[PDB]
Structure formats: structure tokens, C-alpha cells
Design a protein around this ligand. Structure first.
Ligand code: AGS
Ligand code: MG
Length: 408
């Protein structure tokens, strides 16, 4: 009946499902062939075959429905979308489409979208592109993030209040909680705000860190591994950034947690041809910024917030330039100290450095000035000295109870 349902169902059940349809000795062909031999077997004319995926409009004019469970990698069972079909529905890259499909004829190799049933979870007859939505500052509606796990999220909401559509930069040296901090936020996202579309974008990562991230996050984890070509890291990022844009057009609040705007920019640099300023062609930093530029609150409805990590102190001067450029382009930054972490001390947040632009719209005066008197007393406190102060002042309350009960 359904392609993605079939490839998800184990091979053993796939054999015993095909055999009941008169398919002989399926045990001697791969899972892939079995699925094709089953969906094709619905040659019982007028028997419905379905498929789903996220659309990628190719160069020539045609398109394909890429699958999320592959990080939108081009597979042998993508669903072909006609250049004529796109015209009939005004389709775009990032659109999530589903519906009736049919098997490849002779001379064909892929399934083709026979009938459109849904476009971005909306009826096909349904949108001004994110490219022209008006952009309020984004601070209007806040996103707060209780036990021991809520330790980081607590210091996080005090240091850098997040908003609906924040351009957030997470500065980090190696070994500082960079992963666990993101996994803490991603845990605080689905737990407190399930009404939001969470996407975690991992570029140039290790397959194990990818699968451990894929395991922990309630939401769509999309990733490209270290081995894959530079054009691949770009492809994954552009499939995702456009997917978000189409979802905000339907007035959704979308959150993207990018692993490394640093790693993504290294990729674009080698994909964008041809002017040098320290290894990186200065004209290549544009496309990574275009990605980072989408982060906004939309007045007419919805939002896109991108909290991306910036890698620093790696030993490559290129990695420094990437940071130098995106410095200030974000309306929220959170710094991790190499010392507050490597001294076996939790959230390596350098409090004084971390902050968000226009805190006032994200927080009422009673809740805002609460952070101001707090900052004033913490300001002159050292890097590691200031942190352990907050760890112990908070491990004795909830969060709001702090001024309410640490004033005497
Ligand atoms: N929220 C947290 N709670 C407890 N321990 C943490 C937290 N964040 C980081 N750590 C510790 O700090 C170390 C950091 O490792 P990761 O979570 O992989 O961070 P990372 O900075 O992304 O590491 P790299 O540079 O990718 S090898 C881990 O061994 C953890 O024990
Ligand atoms: Mg990491």
C-alpha cells in the first residue's frame, strides 16, 4: 500500500507479505527488490500505491521526493515529480508532499507521483514565500526551557533568553558541553514546546554522534557525516533551510539547531568557486549567511529560529575567520569557556559574555529587572567563580523562586 511503510517494516515480514500475494522465492533478492516486487505487484490495476517525501526541484526543471530517514540523500526509491506536475500546484523545494504513486514503466527506474494528496500537511489547493514576510524583532514571544537536567536550561534562560525566531550563536571551544548543551536544549524544546517544529542539523559529524543524537531528540534529526563530499553538506543544509521556509509560509514556528555554522561554511567555501582573506574566499561566506539570515519572527504568522554553534580555537585560522564574519549577525550569543568546562564544572557558560539582544520584549519588567540586579552582582565575578555561584544559588530553588527566596 505505502512505500515508506514498507521499507520501514522488517525484511522477514516483507517476505511473508509478498508470498501471500503469489510472489515466489523472495528470499533470494534484497529487501529493496522485494519492496519493488511488492508495490509493482499491485499491477492489480486500480490498486492504490502511496508515497511521501520532501520535494527537491532539480536544475533541469524536474524534481524528487527525498526521504527524511536518509537525511535527504538521493536514493534508488525517490519519488519523481514531473515539471508539469510542479506547474499545476506551484511546488517548491522544501515542500512536503504525499499521495498516490505508480511503479516505473519500461525504460524507467523510479516511482512517479501519480496524484498529489497533501502539500505541507495542507490541501493541495493551498502562501507568500518566506522571502517576503515582514519581520518584527522576534522578541514578542519567549521560549522557557524541574530537576538536575534543568540545571543548564535554567542558567540558559537567565543568560540568553531565547525567542520565536532568534538568530542564536553558540560559541564553543573543544570539550565544553557543546553536544550535551544542544541535547539539553533539544530536550527542553520538545518537552516544553511540542507545538514547534524541531530540526537538528548536524554537518560534518561522526556517525555515532549522529545516531546518539538521532536517538535522544524527539524531532527530525538531519545530518551529513564527516566522510561525505562538501557538496553533500551544502545539499543537506539547503534541503532543510527551504523545508523550514515552506513550513513558516503555513504559519508554523520552526526551530533549527545547527551543529556548526563553522562546519557548514567550510563546506560552502569549497563548493562556491572563486579574493582571499585567510584561506577562505570572502565571497563564499554569503551562502552560510543566507542560511543564518532566514532566522526571524514573521508578523503575518509563524517563525524560524536558528540556534547554530560556532567552532573556535580549533587550530585552523579559517575557523577563526568564519567566526569573525558571523560575529554580530546573530541577535543572541552564548559563550562556552574552555576553563569552566575542563575543570569538571557544568554548563561551561561564561555568563558575562552570553546575552540576547532586546531582552525587554522577551521578558516582563518584574522578570527582567530580576536578571539586571543579578547581572550587576555577577558582573565582576570571575569566569569559573561566577558559574559555581549560580549552580549553588539555583540548586536550592526552582527558577523564579530565586529572587523570591534568595533575597532574605
Ligand atoms: N549538560 C551537561 N551535563 C553534564 N556533563 C556535560 C554537559 N555538557 C557537557 N558535559 C561533559 O563535558 C564533556 C563534553 O563532551 P560533549 O557532550 O561530546 O561536548 P563537545 O564539546 O561537543 O565535545 P567534542 O568537542 O565534540 S569531542 C562530556 O564528557 C560530558 O561529560
Ligand atoms: Mg560535539
Amino acid at each position: 500500500m505505502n512505500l515508506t511503510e514498507l521499507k520501514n517494516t522488517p525484511v522477514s515480514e516483507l517476505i511473508t507479505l509478498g508470498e501471500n500475494m503469489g510472489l515466489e522465492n523472495l528470499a533470494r533478492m534484497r529487501k529493496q527488490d522485494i519492496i519493488f516486487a511488492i508495490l509493482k505487484q499491485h499491477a492489480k490495476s486500480g490498486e492504490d500505491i502511496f508515497g511521501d517525501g520532501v520535494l527537491e526541484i532539480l536544475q533541469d526543471g524536474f524534481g524528487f521526493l527525498r526521504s527524511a530517514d536518509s537525511s535527504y540523500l538521493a536514493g534508488p526509491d525517490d519519488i519523481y515529480v514531473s515539471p508539469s506536475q510542479i506547474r499545476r500546484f506551484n511546488l517548491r523545494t522544501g515542500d512536503t508532499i504525499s499521495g498516490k504513486i505508480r511503479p516505473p514503466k519500461e525504460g524507467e527506474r523510479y516511482f512517479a507521483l501519480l496524484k498529489v494528496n497533501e502539500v505541507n500537511f495542507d490541501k493541495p489547493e493551498n502562501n507568500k514565500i518566506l522571502f517576503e514576510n515582514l519581520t518584527p524583532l522576534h522578541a514578542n514571544s519567549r521560549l522557557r526551557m524541574g530537576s538536575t537536567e534543568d540545571l543548564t536550561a535554567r542558567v540558559l534562560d537567565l543568560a540568553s533568553p531565547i525567542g520565536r525566531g532568534q538568530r542564536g550563536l553558540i560559541v564553543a571551544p573543544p570539550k565544553a558541553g557543546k553536544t550535551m548543551l544542544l541535547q539539553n536544549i533539544a530536550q527542553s524544546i520538545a518537552y516544553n514546546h511540542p507545538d514547534c517544529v524541531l530540526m537538528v542539523l548536524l554537518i560534518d559529524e561522526r556517525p555515532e554522534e549522529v545516531t546518539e543524537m538521532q536517538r535522544l531528540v524527539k524531532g527530525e534529526v538531519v545530518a551529513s557525516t564527516f566522510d561525505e563530499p562538501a557538496s553533500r553538506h551544502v545539499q543537506v543544509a539547503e534541503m532543510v533551510i527551504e523545508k523550514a521556509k515552506r513550513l513558516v509560509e503555513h504559519k508554523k514556528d520552526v526551530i533549527i539547531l545547527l551543529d556548526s555554522i563553522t562546519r557548514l561554511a567550510r563546506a560552502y567555501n569549497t563548493v562556491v568557486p572563486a579574493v582571499l582573506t585567510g584561506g577562505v574566499d570572502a565571497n563564499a561566506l554569503h551562502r552560510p549567511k543566507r542560511f543564518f539570515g532566514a532566522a526571524r519572527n514573521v508578523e503575518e504568522g509563524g517563525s524560524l529560529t536558528i540556534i547554530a554553534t560556532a567552532l573556535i580555537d580549533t587550530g585552523s585560522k579559517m575557523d577563526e575567520v568564519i567566526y569573525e564574519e558571523f560575529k554580530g549577525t546573530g541577535n543572541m550569543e552564548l559563550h562556552l569557556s574552555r576553563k569552566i568546562a575542563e575543570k569538571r564544572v557544568f554548563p561551561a557558560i561564561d555568563y558575562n559574555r552570553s546575552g540576547t539582544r532586546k531582552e525587554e520584549l522577551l521578558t516582563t519588567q518584574e522578570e527582567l529587572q530580576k536578571m539586571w540586579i543579578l547581572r550587576k552582582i555577577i558582573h565582576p565575578m570571575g569566569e569559573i567563580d561566577a558559574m559555581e555561584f549560580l549552580i549553588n544559588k539555583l540548586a536550592m530553588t526552582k527558577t523564579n523562586d530565586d529572587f523570591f527566596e534568595m533575597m532574605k
